[PDB]
Amino acid sequence: MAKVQVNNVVVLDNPSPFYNPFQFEITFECIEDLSEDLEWKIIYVGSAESEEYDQVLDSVLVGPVPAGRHMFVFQADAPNPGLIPDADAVGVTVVLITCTYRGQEFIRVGYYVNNEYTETELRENPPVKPDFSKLQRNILASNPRVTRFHINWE
C-alpha cells in the first residue's frame, strides 16, 4: 500500500572530519495514521568484503506515527574505527539509512562516502595504519540510491 513515503533526505555537515557525526535531515510522509512502530537506522559499511563489519551507528524508534508530513534530523555518531579493516578505511564505502515498519524493512537509502586524507603529504604517502583524525569524510550526497521493498502494512 506504501503507507510511508520518504520524500527527501538532505545530508548535512558534508564534507567533515571522519569523527564528525552523521546528520541527515529526513522528510517523509504517512498517508494515514500508523498503528505500529517506525524504526530508523543508520548503518555504516566498514568493509565491502563482509557484512560482519556493518556498524549500526544509531536507531530511532517512534510509534504511533500520525498521518501527514514529518521532518527530523537523524544524527548518529561516527563508526568505531577499531572495528574497520585497515584496507577498507581509506577510499569509497557505503552508508545506509534504513526504515522499518512492523519489523519489516521497507526502504533502504544508500550513499557512497569517500574517506580521504586532506594533507597532500598524507595523500601521497598514506600511513600503514589509517589516521582517522586526518581522514575527511565526503558523502556522495548528490547520488542517493533508494531501494523500496514490499512489506505488509496491515
Partner: protein
C-alpha cells in the same frame, strides 16, 4: 564437480560496457558470476515457492514476475 556457469565472459564484458565500465579486472568475471548466482538463487527460490504453493508442476513467467517483485526496486532519487 559441477562449476556450471550461466553467463559467459564476453557477455560479462558486454554488460559491463552497457553499465559504462571501461576496464575490468580479472577477478571481475568470478565476482559477477557469484553475484549472478546469488540473485538467481533468490529469485528461483521465490518462484518455486510460489509454484509449489499454487500446486503446479511447471513454473511460469507469471511466477517469475511474482518472485521478481519480491527482490526490491532501486530508484535513483526520491521523487521517482
Amino acid at each position: 564437480r559441477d562449476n556450471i556457469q550461466g553467463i559467459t565472459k564476453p557477455a560479462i564484458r558486454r554488460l559491463a560496457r552497457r553499465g559504462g565500465v571501461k576496464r575490468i579486472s580479472g577477478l571481475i568475471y568470478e565476482e559477477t558470476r557469484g553475484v549472478l548466482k546469488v540473485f538467481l538463487e533468490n529469485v528461483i527460490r521465490d518462484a518455486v515457492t510460489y509454484t509449489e504453493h499454487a500446486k503446479r508442476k511447471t513454473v511460469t513467467a507469471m511466477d517469475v514476475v511474482y518472485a521478481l517483485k519480491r527482490q526490491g526496486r532501486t530508484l535513483y532519487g526520491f521523487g521517482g
